[PDB]
Write a protein that binds this ligand. Sequence first.
Ligand SMILES: O=C(O)CNC(=O)C(=O)O
Ligand SMILES: [Mn+2]
Length: 235
Amino acid sequence: STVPRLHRPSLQHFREQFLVPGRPVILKGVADHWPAMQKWSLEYIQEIAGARTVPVEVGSRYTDEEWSQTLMTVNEFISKYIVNEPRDVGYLAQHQLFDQIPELKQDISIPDYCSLGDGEEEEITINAWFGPQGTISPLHQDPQQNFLVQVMGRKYIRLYSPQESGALYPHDTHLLHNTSQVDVENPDLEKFPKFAKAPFLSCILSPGEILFIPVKYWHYVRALDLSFSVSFCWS
Ligand SMILES: O=C(O)CNC(=O)C(=O)O
Ligand SMILES: [Mn+2]
């Protein structure tokens, strides 16, 4: 099935129908008037952030044995992994860019829905996810609520309830236990037969849309275009 899309639901409606039961939804009409939606382009990103050092994940998926993490400038990242026919997949993933570069923080807004949480606003973490077409974040689950805001490009996203965890074959080690052993888009059904029948939601997340990923919901993400998303991690 597809993730439902709602236009600016009330706080109460979001709390009662999505946050408390732990059900995904796409919020429309909320982030579409972030300044980022019209300002962020490669040129603007280079102007404001190009000289700054960022961590870059290199490799198809963080579960790959070739995968590694390095450091470079934002200008270098764009040159090597976006604009010039890249040799390998690079991803400026899970980085607190807005703490590093407060000028860019002015182009976004924390969703008012986060105030329904039991945590402090000062404890919300804001992460950038910026990369070329084809980045893949393998199926995993996170320990907080998430609003994933799409600014540039589109992402294909697959969501599996925590009720389906047994069909997702989590890694057995403590370090990887919140990551699935399965490749969502080409699963080894000989090794992982229960995966095939596990129900899920999916969507293509487009610019200006916010996906609510409930705490512990399993998610898999593939960028369909040059993409920039902003996540808000909250409780
Ligand atoms: O956007 C991606 O590639 C992956 N995102 C996440 O896992 C997240 O926001 O928690
Ligand atoms: Mn995640």
